[PDB]
Design a protein around this ligand. Sequence first.
Ligand SMILES: O=C1Cc2cc(Nc3nc(Cl)ncc3Br)ccc2N1
Ligand SMILES: O=C1Cc2cc(Nc3nc(Cl)ncc3Br)ccc2N1
Ligand SMILES: [Cl-]
Ligand SMILES: [Cl-]
Lengths: 124, 124, 4, 4
Amino acid sequence: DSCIQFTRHASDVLLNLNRLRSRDILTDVVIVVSREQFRAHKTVLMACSGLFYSIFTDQLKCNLSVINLDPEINPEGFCILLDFMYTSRLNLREGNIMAVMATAMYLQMEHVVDTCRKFIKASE
Amino acid sequence: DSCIQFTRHASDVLLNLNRLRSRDILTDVVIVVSREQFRAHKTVLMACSGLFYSIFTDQLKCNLSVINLDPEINPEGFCILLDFMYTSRLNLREGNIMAVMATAMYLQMEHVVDTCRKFIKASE
Amino acid sequence: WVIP
Amino acid sequence: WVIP
Ligand SMILES: O=C1Cc2cc(Nc3nc(Cl)ncc3Br)ccc2N1
Ligand SMILES: O=C1Cc2cc(Nc3nc(Cl)ncc3Br)ccc2N1
Ligand SMILES: [Cl-]
Ligand SMILES: [Cl-]
């Protein structure tokens, strides 16, 4: 086509989606990770995670307001990944890399799994 | 912070949101523009438009499944802008620029209004 | 704005 | 991935 493109549009959209998350506006699901609860937008979760995409395209699960993750999932690892979904920034640290990678594999977040594997390979 | 960032994340999220729109997955509102109907995600509309942000943060309007736009709004102009919201690409043409700018002013999409004003100023 |  |  003969379209023009606004370079910052996708980033500005995500920044606004994160502002809605921070103010709990139009969040439509709670993700339960053991004793912790995380409110989010189903569409954003699906856009970032192969697991959430599969869950919310399921004709029965699409209507659930609460999703319980596997008990092996670490709440901090999930929190770091949820922040990444809404900001593009990943708080990857020596103390959390194993939990973050395990959570990203479960959530099916391929690019996160890739950088975790590379950061781990560098420290061995 | 000491975060790392994935450059393409925001673009990949928007591409996935557009895929959900194309398959009518988790769309939660219909925008009526005269005889035409457009299905969309309230969160994406709010993230792109000052008008939709104001509408869906209203304690009563937040719960509506149908929003009727002002009858002066052109359905093609709205369609072009809805595509822009989900892709960052604007199909701006001599034949549609006036309708697109009028629709972007109504929807409160400042960057679109800015490029329309510049493209119009160049042709005078 | 750019030519994509 | 980059240093933002
Ligand atoms: O690593 C990742 C990230 C991700 C996101 C989605 N999400 C969607 N995929 C498609 Cl094709 N259409 C719409 C949506 Br929402 C699917 C798989 C994966 N794997
Ligand atoms: O030209 C534009 C585009 C736009 C988008 C929003 N959307 C939001 N703004 C804020 Cl501050 N927080 C959350 C959201 Br969603 C507000 C105003 C405008 N004007
Ligand atoms: Cl990822
Ligand atoms: Cl805009």
